[PDB]
Amino acid sequence: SLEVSVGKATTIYAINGSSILLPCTFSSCYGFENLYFKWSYNNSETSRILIDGIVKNDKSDPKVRVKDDDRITLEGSTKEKTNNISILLSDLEFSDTGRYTCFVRNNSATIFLQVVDK
Amino acid sequence: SLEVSVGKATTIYAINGSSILLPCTFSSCYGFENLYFKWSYNNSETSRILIDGIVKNDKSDPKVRVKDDDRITLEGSTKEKTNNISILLSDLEFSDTGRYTCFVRNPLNNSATIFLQVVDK
């Protein structure tokens, strides 16, 4: 049915030492089987995988495949209207400032995360 | 096809005296004809209309119907992969801080939310 979005990208400010939710949802007009998704981190120096996973079908919650940061928790859920593959990043440091890309296969969203003191 | 979103809501910080884009896009697997949309401001006693309009079809850019703030410009466009009905709010003041809602109706309905915080810096 009729869906709305604030876009494929946004900027989030988060507090040093705290946690933050990196939001991403997806949808398909023609269903899906074993959908692959991946969260990655980019800054001007380095790039790396954070977590990836599989959404088996439109009635199964996302499941983690590999994870490269213990501070990350998958916070996904599969419901009638929304396929949620958001992640929680805990114990933030200033070095966590950067671009977070969520890639979905069988498109990409971008979170610009800025870690601040207050 | 395959779409991705950062959600139906976000928070945007903007600078006093400047401008800001309030983003919203919509999608319908069933398509649409003469889709109605409305931007409202919600941190008052009663909600204040900002601008509403119509998207005729998947090949026509959004068009303004009524507008209640001359500081607002529709920045919409209709392309193959994206139905954009964002607006630009110029000449920001601190009183512009609040909740912005973008409502869409297909002749069901849905709504996206922008929490705008105006700061001096």
Numbering used by the authors:
A (entry chain A): 30 to 135, 143 to 154
B (entry chain B): 30 to 136, 141 to 154
Manuscript text:
Voltage-gated sodium channels are transmembrane proteins responsible for the generation of action potentials, and play important roles in the modulation of electrical impulses. They consist of a pore-forming α subunit and one or more auxiliary β subunits.
We determined the structure of the mouse β4 subunit extracellular domain fragment (β4ex) by X-ray crystallography. Unlike the human β4 subunit extracellular domain fragment used in the previous crystallographic study, which had either the C58A or C131W mutation, the present fragment contains all three of the Cys residues. The molecular structure of β4ex is highly superimposable on that of the C58A mutant14, except for the N-terminal region and the mutated residues. The N-terminal region of β4 does not participate in the β-sheet of the Ig fold, and appears to be flexible. The β4ex structure exhibits a remarkable feature: a highly ordered multimeric assembly of β4ex molecules is formed in the crystal lattice, and the β4ex molecules interact with each other in an antiparallel manner. The antiparallel arrangement is mediated by the interaction of the C″–D loop of one β4 molecule with strands B, D, and E of the β-sheet composed of strands B, E–E′, and D–D′ of the other β4 molecule. The side chain of Arg94 in the C″–D loop hydrogen bonds with the side and main chains of Ser48 in strand B. The side chain of Asp97 in the C″–D loop hydrogen bonds with the side chain of Asn113 in strand E. Val95, in the C″–D loop, participates in a hydrophobic interaction with Leu50 in strand B. This antiparallel interface is asymmetric between the two β4ex molecules, and can successively array the β4ex molecules in a linear manner. In the present β4 structure, this disulfide bond is not formed at a distance of 3.3 Å.
